[PDB]
Amino acid sequence: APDIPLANVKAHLTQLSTIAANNGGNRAHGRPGYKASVDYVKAKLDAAGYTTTLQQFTSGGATGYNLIANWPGGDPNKVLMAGAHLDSVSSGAGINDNGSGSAAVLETALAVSRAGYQPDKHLRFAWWGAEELGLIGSKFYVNNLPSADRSKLAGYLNFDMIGSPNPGYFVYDDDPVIEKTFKNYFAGLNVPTEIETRSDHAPFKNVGVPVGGLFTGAGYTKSAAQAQKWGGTAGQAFDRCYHSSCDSLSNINDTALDRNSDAAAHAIWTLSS
Ligand SMILES: N[C@@H](Cc1c[nH]c2ccccc12)C(=O)O
Ligand SMILES: N[C@@H](Cc1c[nH]c2ccccc12)C(=O)O
Ligand SMILES: [Ca+2]
Ligand SMILES: [Zn+2]
Ligand SMILES: [Zn+2]
Numbered sequence: 542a543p544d545i546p547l548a549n550v551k552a553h554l555t556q557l558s559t560i561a562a563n564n565g566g567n568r569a570h571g572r573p574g575y576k577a578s579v580d581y582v583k584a585k586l587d588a589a590g591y592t593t594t595l596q597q598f599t600s601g602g603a604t605g606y607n608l609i610a611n612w613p614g615g616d617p618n619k620v621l622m623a624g625a626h627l628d629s630v631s632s633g634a635g636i637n638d639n640g641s642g643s644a645a646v647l648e649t650a651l652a653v654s655r656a657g658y659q660p661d662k663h664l665r666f667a668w669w670g671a672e673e674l675g676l677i678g679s680k681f682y683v684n685n686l687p688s689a690d691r692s693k694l695a696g697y698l699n700f701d702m703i704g705s706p707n708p709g710y711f712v713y714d715d716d717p718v719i720e721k722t723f724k725n726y727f728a729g730l731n732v733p734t735e736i737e738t739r740s741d742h743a744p745f746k747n748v749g750v751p752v753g754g755l756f757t758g759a760g761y762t763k764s765a766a767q768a769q770k771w772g773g774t775a776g777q778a779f780d781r782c783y784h785s786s787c788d789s790l791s792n793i794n795d796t797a798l799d800r801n802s803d804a805a806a807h808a809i810w811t812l813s814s
Pocket of ligand 3: 544545546547799800803
């Protein structure tokens with residue numbers, strides 16, 4: 542896999558921050574900052590050669606969108622998916638929650654094209670709408686994916702909050718092959734991980750698609766033991782600005798964002814061979 546350039550990921554976050562500022566301070570479902578987020582991500586993907594789909598739904602009286610990006614080629618009967626919700630809550634720009642996951646997934650999809658990669662499995666990336674309303678966009682996608690296409694899914698990888706300023710390194714304990722691929726990447730860095738103990742992998746998991754993912758923590762408090770193994774501040778939240786107006790460009794730990802973006806690409810390459 543390539544090394545995902547941290548600066549490229551950070552630059553997507555800067556664009557999402559500007560989009561929030563230009564649209565009432567947020568990127569929330571039913572508000573213009575969400576669709577403007579979608580348009581930015583879509584234009585990058587289209588220019589890199591993806592076949593993109595805007596999947597529209599209505600929730601709460603307002604139009605929502607999922608953005609689906611298929612990399613042409615690969616075995617149609619073995620599809621590997623990776624995704625991240627692209628909506629924020631309306632209190633702020635949602636840069637860690639979940640610009641961080643959205644930017645890592647986008648930069649990994651751009652890296653495929655830059656590398657001239659031809660994965661054996663077909664790759665499909667997704668940016669979900671309306672996750673903050675209760676997984677509405679990912680539930681819509683799974684509910685509208687015919688069973689014949691569901692059965693073609695080899696896995697779904699989810700990235701929701703991966704740049705927390707006081708981070709832990711959590712790996713979902715779901716499908717064993719996906720979990721081992723992420724833990725192998727962190728082992729090469731000599732960075733320990735813990736099992737993740739309510740995001741867009743749930744609708745996939747619940748219909749038997751193998752899932753996994755990465756998370757750096759939200760409102761819970763970092764323990765003494767976690768500060769000893771990962772650094773940071775014991776007794777403070779992993780993300781002190783969770784769902785807050787302060788979930789801004791300042792609310793990112795660059796090392797966590799870099800490690801989780803690189804791990805995302807590692808798993809996507811490994812699992813699509
Ligand atoms: N889905 C949550 C974030 C979150 C909290 N705890 C998690 C555990 C795993 C994955 C995601 C989470 C949100 O968007 O605010
Ligand atoms: N995100 C920076 C820390 C930081 C907070 N606010 C900043 C403003 C400018 C530059 C860096 C920062 C890091 O992870 O090291
Ligand atoms: Ca990197
Ligand atoms: Zn989230
Ligand atoms: Zn959230």
